[PDB]
């Protein structure tokens, strides 16, 4: 019965590819050729969150676009004030190994987890005055690569054991499970409406999931290497996946296929983090080549280089108000560009 | 600065705390521990030392060793091996009572992030390897081996085979042999760490 199932799967893949290619009436390039280019975008280092003594792995902006949380392997997750350079909090992490850090939209909660297979929850507004551990979310058999807060109660965590999970911080038990990936799920990004999310795994596939009943809606392929970054478009109708092959593409949910690719001859280092702008025109994609380019998400061309780091960047987040972008590289210096 | 003065004061106090913690965390020595599954990883320093990563620490002759027994991570090596770029020395353990360990050593000794990091090697299970050689020839594990089947020469050939997989002369493999019961492992780790510490100190001062 294996042969029949394999033939059915091959026919289904062929018909899916035919349907996807049948809707590509016009490419995005000949549509974006009508806009004048945005021109060179120059951003100066307005601030620098000095105070870290290890490699930076996360920089998540608050909903007020003033508080940024940075996580490092020194064992501390310092919460910064982006206007006055001040450090609001310094959470002592249980384990130095951290590759993701989440900031709740309401600002009360901070999530952080790494190689421990545990996504710990930190309560910023504790009555005792000190930040403490709220809920330790255990249950994964692989490293937690990305965790994002849907709301104050539910957090969607991406693990390295091919299992994107939806949690319940109140009870600490996985309410719903997402499965279907073969490689490590290295990235995750919730939609603006917090009803669905994408995930870019190590097997060069970005599958969008459904938060409610936990079933994959669409699957996207085209990357020849692992996906290190993923993030939704500002409109929620598209997303961009950062691959380790020095290329990032802009998939669309309505078109069910990639629209444009962001590649150049002179770039070979692997992308580490990607993010959009408030209007969605600028795509600040980090790189392992010590810089952090900005991509015109319509014209699909370079518009500037935020080369101000002495090592590879691991996170690049844009404020909720579009005011600034925080690039936290491995050299411990998180710079708040603008 | 109406009440932001106290905000700056808190920032300075916790920055001082961060600096103190950072300079107190540089005392410890990081030792990534690798090897095959059940390859004697947790039977080397049992005279000392206490699901994902497993961290173990012990003190030996005024040194705190951070021994990250990462052997419990059943995932891709590539996606989380850059977190150990700043490791002092990789401790590689190989069981001699059993090609997979050789492949792992080849992949890890020539890794992009481990160009200048010495990779110690612990050829373990001396007695078991000796009995296996006395009962079975090394052709089973090493078909290309061409020599008498005894303990010393076969062990030397295996050690040379592991060492020859190095391709960068900027690193040296501190090969060693243990009988799964000797306590000399701590001394070997200590002297290797002393050597690499001296090398790093000379590198920092513009001397190595």
């Amino acid at each position, epitope marked *: 019965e294996l042969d029949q199932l394999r033939q059915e799967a091959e026919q289904l893949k062929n018909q899916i590819r035919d349907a996807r290619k049948a809707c590509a009436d016009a490419t995005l390039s000949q549509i974006t050729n009508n806009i004048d280019p945005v021109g060179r975008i120059q951003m100066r280092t307005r601030r620098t969150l000095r105070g870290h003594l290890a490699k930076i792995y996360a920089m998540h902006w608050g909903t007020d676009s003033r508080l940024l949380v940075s996580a490092s392997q020194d064992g501390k997750l310092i919460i910064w004030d982006s206007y006055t350079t*001040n450090k*609001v909090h310094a959470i002592p992490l249980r384990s130095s190994w951290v590759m993701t850090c989440a900031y709740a939209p309401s600002g009360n909660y901070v999530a952080c987890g790494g190689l421990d297979n545990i996504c710990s929850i930190y309560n910023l*507004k504790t*009555r*005792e*005055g000190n930040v403490r551990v709220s809920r330790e979310l255990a249950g994964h058999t692989g490293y937690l690569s990305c965790c994002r807060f849907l709301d104050d109660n539910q957090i969607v965590t991406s693990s390295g054991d091919t299992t994107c999970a939806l949690w319940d911080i109140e009870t600490g038990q996985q309410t719903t499970t997402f499965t279907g990936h073969t490689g490590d799920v290295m990235s995750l990004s919730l939609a603006p409406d917090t009803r669905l999310f994408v995930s870019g795994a190590c097997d060069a596939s970005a599958k969008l999931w459904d938060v409610r009943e936990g079933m994959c809606r669409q699957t996207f392929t085209g990357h020849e290497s692992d996906i290190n970054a993923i993030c939704f478009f500002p409109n929620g109708n598209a997303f961009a996946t950062g691959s380790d092959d020095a290329t990032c593409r802009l998939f669309d949910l309505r078109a069910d296929q990639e629209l444009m690719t962001y590649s150049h001859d002179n770039i070979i280092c692997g992308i580490t983090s990607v993010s959009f702008s408030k209007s969605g025109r600028l795509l600040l994609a980090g790189y392992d080549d010590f810089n952090c380019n900005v991509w015109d998400a319509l014209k699909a061309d370079r518009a500037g280089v935020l080369a101000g780091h002495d090592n590879r960047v691991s996170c690049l987040g844009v404020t909720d108000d579009g005011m600034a972008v925080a690039t936290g590289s491995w050299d411990s210096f998180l710079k708040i560009w603008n | 600065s109406a009440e932001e003065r106290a905000a700056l004061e*808190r920032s300075k*106090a916790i920055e001082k705390n961060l600096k103190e913690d950072g300079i107190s965390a540089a005392k410890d020595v990081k030792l990534l521990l690798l090897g095959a599954d059940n390859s004697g990883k947790s039977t080397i320093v049992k005279q000392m030392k206490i699901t994902g990563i497993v961290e173990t620490h012990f003190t030996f002759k005024n040194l705190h060793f951070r021994l990250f027994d990462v052997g419990g991570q059943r995932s891709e090596r590539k996606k989380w091996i850059h977190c150990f770029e700043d490791v002092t020395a990789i401790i590689f353990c190989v069981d001699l009572s059993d090609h997979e360990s050789l492949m792992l050593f080849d992949s890890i000794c020539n890794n992009k992030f481990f160009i200048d990091t010495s990779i110690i090697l612990f050829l373990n299970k001396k007695d078991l390897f000796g009995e296996k050689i006395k009962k079975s020839p090394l052709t089973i594990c090493f078909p290309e081996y061409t020599g008498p089947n005894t303990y010393e020469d076969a062990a030397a050939y295996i050690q040379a085979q592991f060492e020859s997989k190095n391709r960068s002369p900027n690193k040296e493999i501190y090969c060693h042999m243990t009988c799964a019961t000797d306590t000399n492992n701590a001394q070997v780790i200590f002297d290797a760490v002393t050597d690499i510490i001296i090398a790093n100190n000379l590198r920092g001062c513009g001397l190595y």
Partner: single-chain antibody
Amino acid sequence: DVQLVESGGGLVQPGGSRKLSCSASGFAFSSFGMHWVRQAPEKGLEWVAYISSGSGTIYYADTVKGRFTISRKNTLFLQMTSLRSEDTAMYYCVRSIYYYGSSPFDFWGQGTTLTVSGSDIVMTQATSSVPVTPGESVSISCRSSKSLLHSNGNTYLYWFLQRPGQSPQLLIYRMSNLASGVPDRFSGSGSGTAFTLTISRLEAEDVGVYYCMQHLEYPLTFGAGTKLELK
């Protein structure tokens, strides 16, 4: 949970000495800059001193400087020396933290009674008694000598409610934000120079004495004190 108990009262002869100790238990004491606020038996509250986290800086009032010593085992100390005839009051130990979005003067100590035998910003509450019935809408207006809205946009007009026989509790801080554990019935207002603490659907637990507070700069001068009498 959070408690700031204290002791060290009793009759003190004029010109004598006494020790006031604030025993803060149940929270991270070392991260809070404890204040000290007193209140005459028939007058409004008045600031006394201030010690930061780790004793980095210690401030004092105009009539407090020199003869009072504030020091910090999870205990805050105040040293009473050369007690005049105006030192009689009830002394309140008040914790406070200052970061982005913080809630200064969140918890006030129970207080102990002590008895004896002009360049600052003054707080003026011209109204002294607003008689209202339960379920009605009331407003308590407090005025300022100089504008409190700083350059960053934050105005320092803290609102405190003191029920009869109870320690004061923060209700509205920064004239717009609302403190934790406070029902949405109380709502801050005001802009620039004049401030009001609007009350919506006033209940039987909202009756007491209000004390508008400024925090633009030291000393911390309280308002005159408005008593929201029932009916």
